[PDB]
Design a protein around this ligand. Structure first.
Ligand code: HEC
Length: 97
C-alpha cells in the first residue's frame, strides 16, 4: 500500500486524530495543516523548521522538544512505531497544506 494512504489509515488507527486536526483547527495539539515546512518555536524560545527529521523526532522521541504554548502530552507508545509506519505518517503530514 502507498505510504500516503497507509499514513491516512494510521492517522486514525494510532489516535493522532484525537489531538491533531487536518483543517487548521487547534485541538489538544497543533494542526497538521501547513505543518511541514513551517517554523516552530519551542517552550525554551528556540526555533526550528519542521523538516522530515523534526517530524520523525516529534513522533519517535515524544516530549523531547515541545512546541510553545502546548501541554507536554505526546504519547509514549509511538516510540515503538516501525520505520514504514513513521514514513507513512510523515508522507500523510507533508501533504496537509
Ligand atoms: C494528544 C494526547 C496527542 C496525540 C494522541 C498525538 N499527539 Fe502529537 N502532539 C500533541 C501535542 C500536545 C503536541 C505539541 C507539544 C509538543 O510535543 O511539541 C504534539 C506535537 C506533535 C508534532 C509536532 C507538531 C508541530 O506543530 O510542531 C508532531 C509531528 C506530532 N505531534 C505527531 C503526532 C502523530 C503522528 C500522532 C499519532 C501517531 C500524534 N502526534 C498523536 C498531542 C498529541
Amino acid at each position: 500500500m502507498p505510504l500516503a494512504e497507509l499514513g491516512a489509515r494510521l492517522y486514525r488507527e494510532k489516535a493522532c486524530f484525537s489531538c491533531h486536526s487536518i483543517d487548521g483547527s487547534r485541538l489538544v495539539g497543533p494542526s497538521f495543516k501547513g505543518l511541514y515546512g513551517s517554523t516552530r518555536t519551542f517552550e525554551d524560545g528556540t526555533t526550528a523548521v519542521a523538516d522530515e527529521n523534526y517530524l520523525r523526532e516529534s513522533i519517535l522521541q515524544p516530549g523531547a522538544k515541545v512546541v510553545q504554548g502546548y501541554p507536554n502530552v505526546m504519547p509514549a507508545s509511538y516510540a515503538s512505531l516501525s520505520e514504514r509506519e513513521v514514513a507513512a505518517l510523515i508522507e500523510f503530514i507533508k501533504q496537509q497544506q
